[PDB]
């Protein structure tokens, strides 16, 4: 049921044709400019300022979090009974 | 040993358009047909002027022979000067009025010039192929310019040549690029690229100074509502 719902949502997301549009009321970086988008946005709040492009900043290698891994599993009933005894 | 004073040449060309005439068939007056055709372009009943060089040669104007020889010898350059003088004549006729919007490029230009509002700025921002929207063509009838296909050789490169022949093959009409327009993603600026010849290379990175200094990495996307095409 998860797979069917996810695939139907994704294939219903797509739209056919294109165009380009101006958001009147939002300023651009360059002077006297309005914001410009190049996909058929449903509503102005769906706009994202192309944050999907921008590469994320990383911490240096000395200061990243780290886990410690123990190989941990739910063993069979036979092994669990022997270990309990 | 070259002449590049374009203003004097423009003065000569405008004097030709002002002073060529033909008498009316009833004798009632004079027709000034070239400036009538210029006003037809100004009111957008027309798209091209066809100029006869022999009329320039036989006009009653000083330096007429020199102007005709210069047109014939460097025709690819004098087309620009004719377009500039006709544009100045159109603005002198039109005054503070506006020419009618008829197509999407006209609508884009009329909307965007007043968005820019809301001559140095105009001429720096827009290329002249986009500012001027009409055609100029030349003709000759004197037998000095009559040649065959066989005779057109290295002395004729850049010159005006006339000939007569039979058509073997012809293609159908296609759209040809004249000016491309690109818009930036991040900073919403525009780039205008005129095209000459049978090839062009599109630019990739945005040239606007604020975008470059901020290192915003905005791509350029081409737009065909602002771009110019020709048959
Ligand atoms: Zn940019």
From Swiss-Prot, chain A:
Disruption effect? Answer: RNAi-mediated knockdown is embryonic lethal. In germline cells, aberrant segregation of chromosomes is observed during both mitosis and meiosis, resulting in aneuploidy. There is a weaker mitosis phenotype in somatic tissues. Weak seam cell differentiation capacity during the L4 larval development stage, including 30% increased seam cell fusion and reduced cell cycle exit. RNAi-mediated knockdown increases the survival rate and partially restores alae formation of let-7 n2853 mutants at 20 dgrees Celsius.
Record localization: Nucleus
The entry sums up its family as follows: Belongs to the timeless family.
Briefly state the protein's biological role.
Plays an important role in chromosome cohesion during both mitosis and meiosis. In prophase of meiosis, it is involved in the formation of the synaptonemal complex (SC) and specifically, in the diplotene and diakinesis phases of prophase, it stabilizes the association of homologous chromosomes during synapsis and sister chromatid cohesion. It regulates cohesin subunits to promote meiotic chromosome cohesion and localizes non-SMC (structural maintenance of chromosome) cohesin subunits to chromatin prior to or during pre-meiotic S phase.
Q: How does it assemble?
A: Associates with the cohesin complex. Interacts with smc-1, smc-3, scc-1 and scc-3.
Record protein name field: Protein timeless homolog
Query: Gene encoding this polypeptide?
Result: tim-1
